[PDB]
Structure 1
Amino acid sequence: MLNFKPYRVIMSSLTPVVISGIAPSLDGILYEALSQAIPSNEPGVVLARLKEILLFNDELGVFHASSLRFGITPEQGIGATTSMRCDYLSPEKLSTAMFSPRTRRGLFTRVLLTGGPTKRRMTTRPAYSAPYLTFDFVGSSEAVEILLNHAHVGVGYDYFSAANGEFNNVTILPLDIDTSISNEGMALRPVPVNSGLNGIKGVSPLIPPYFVGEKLNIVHPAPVRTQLISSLLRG
């Protein structure tokens, strides 16, 4: 229970953002940030504290936290780059000082890195490299500023592991109209199908974390939305 005002948050993207099909919702970023702030992974308490910094739609069952929208400037636009993760079995990793390989003829059985359960996993994921990221939300500007600046949270699939979508220079500006849930009838974030908002059908939990809870039918915006930075700063 705190006075919530519609704010738009714009940050400078530093690394490619990997979208997990559904555009990353700022509510999820804030949920992760609070899970870091409150040393607890229990969804109930983290959600209860998230409602204190974000406006929650009871009738609609979501937080006022728009999905990711790529702020593109006339200098740099939305770019297609691959978030690229490779196992690097260095000579130090491949040495008897670190483990005991099975031996035959006194020779150490080399690890088959070309394939199998012990291969060099070349996991490549799509990622969108825009100069800025933007979200809208009806919440406390102080708490979200503190979280986004100091909590280890990024935009995309794995900021924790892959460090994808690192951001900085988080700038919050007030808005005039709440553009978190709806935008002239176009959902700007995951919402239930019965809400009457159009967009793209999908399956996902309405409330974060988006990897737990029954995946019920939802309507979500385009995964990759781009807007001019000048238009985003207009408010």
Structure 2
Amino acid sequence: MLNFKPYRVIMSSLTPVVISGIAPSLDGILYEALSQAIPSNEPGVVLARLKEILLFNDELGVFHASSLRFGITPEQGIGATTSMRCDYLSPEKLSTAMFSPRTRRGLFTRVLLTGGPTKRRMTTRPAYSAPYLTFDFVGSSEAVEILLNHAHVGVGYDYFSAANGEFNNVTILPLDIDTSISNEGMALRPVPVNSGLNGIKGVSPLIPPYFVGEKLNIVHPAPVRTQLISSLLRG
């Protein structure tokens, strides 16, 4: 419970952003940041404390936190890059000092890295590498700024593990019109189907975390949205 203003947050993307089908919502980033800030993972309490720094639409059941929208400058644009996570079974990893290989005549059975459950998993994921990441939200600038600057949260998939979509130089600029939920009838974040907002149909929980809770039908924006950084800083 605190006075909440429409803010647009623009940050410099330092690593490619991996989008999990639905565009990463700023409310999910803030939920992770709060889960880190209050050392408790329970969705209920973290949500309860997220409402104190984000406006929550009760009649619509969503947080006023627009989805990810890439800010592209005339010099750098939205690009297609691959976030590549590859097993590195080093010789030091592959050594008797760390484990006891099954032996046959004093020879150690080599790990079959080619295939099988012990393979060198070369997982490639689509990632988007734009110069800037932008979100819009109706909230307290102070708390969200502190969280995004100091909480270990990125934009996209598994920022903890893959370090995807890391950002720095978080800049918050106040907006004149609330562009978090709706904009000329185009949904700017996951919103329920019945809201009358048009976009792309999908299945996902409305409130974060977006990997627990019944996946009800929702309308969400285009996963990859691009705007000129000048158009975004115009306000």
For Structure 1 versus Structure 2, the TM-score category normalised by the shorter chain is over 0.9
Shift of 1:31: 0.1
Deviation readout 1:119-178 (Å, 9 max, x if unpaired): 000000000000000000000000000000000000001111000000000000000000
Name 2:157's counterpart in structure 1. 157
2:138 maps to 1:138 = yes
Residue 175 of structure 2 corresponds to which residue in structure 1? 175
Secondary structure of residue in 2 paired with 1:54: coil
How many residues are paired up? 235
For residues 34-54 of structure 1, what are the alpha-carbon distances to aligned partners after superposition, in whole Å with 9 as ceiling and x for unaligned?
000000000000000000000
Give aligned-pair identity as a percent.
100
> What are structure 2's unaligned runs of at least 5 residues?
none
- The 4+ residue runs of structure 1 with deviation greater than 2 A are none
Q: Deviation per CA, 1:23-79, whole angstroms, max 9, x where unpaired? A: 000000000000000000000000000000000000000000000000000000000
Matches of 2:160 and 2:206, distance apart in 1: 22
Match of 1:99, SS state, is coil
- Distance in 2, Cα, partners of 1:6 & 1:176: 7
Equivalent residue, structure 1, for 2:78: 78
Pairwise CA distance, 1:186:
0.2
SS at match of 2:161: helix
How far apart are 1:209 and its partner, in Å?
0.1
Which whole-Å CA distance do the structure 2 matches of 1:157 and 1:190 have between them?
Answer: 17
Secondary structure (helix, strand or coil) at the match of 1:65 reads coil
Please give the alpha-carbon distance, in whole angstroms, between the structure 1 residues aligned to 2:25 and 2:206.
10
Structure 1 CA distance for aligned equivalents of residues 217 and 140 of structure 2: 29
TM-score, normalisation: structure 1? 1.00
Q: Secondary structure at the match of 2:217?
A: strand
Matches of 2:212 and 2:139, distance apart in 1: 24
Give the 3-state SS of the residue equivalent to 2:50 in structure 1.
Answer: helix
Q: Which residue of 1 aligns with 2:8?
A: 8
CA distance in 1, matches of 2:178, 2:48: 22
Q: CA separation in 2, counterparts of 1:111 and 1:221?
A: 45
Q: Distance in 1 between matches of 2:127 and 2:181?
A: 25
- Counterparts of 1:234 and 1:175, CA distance in 2: 9
Task: Note the C-alpha offset of 1:3.
Answer: 0.3
For 1:135 and 1:126, locate their aligned partners in 2 and report how far apart those are by CA, in whole Å. 21
CA distance in 1, matches of 2:67, 2:25: 4
How far residue 229 of structure 1 moved from its aligned partner, in angstroms, is 0.1
Residue number in structure 1 paired with 2:65: 65
* Secondary structure in structure 2 of the residue aligned to 1:46: helix
In the superposition, the TM-score normalised over structure 2's length comes to 1.00
- The 3-state SS of whatever aligns with 1:227 is strand
Cα offset for 1:190? 0.1
For residues 65 and 98 of structure 1, the distance between their equivalents in structure 2, rounded to whole angstroms, comes to 47
Could you list the runs of 5+ residues in structure 1 that have no partner in the other structure?
none
Q: Tell me, what secondary structure is at the counterpart of 1:11?
A: strand
Pair 1:39 & 2:39 matched: yes
| SS state at 2:218 partner | strand
The C-alpha deviation readout for 1:186-207, integer Å capped at 9, x for no partner, is 0000000000000000000000
Superposed CA deviations along residues 82-141 of structure 1, whole A, max 9, x for unmatched, are 000000000010000000000001100000000000000000000000000000000000
User: Which whole-Å CA distance do the structure 2 matches of 1:157 and 1:214 have between them?
Assistant: 20
CA distance in 2 between partners of 1:159 and 1:43 (Å): 19
**Aligned-pair RMSD on alpha carbons?**
0.3
User: How far apart are the structure 2 equivalents of 1:157 and 1:53?
Assistant: 23
In the alignment, the residues of structure 2 paired with residue 24 and residue 57 of structure 1 have an alpha-carbon distance, to the nearest angstrom, of: 18
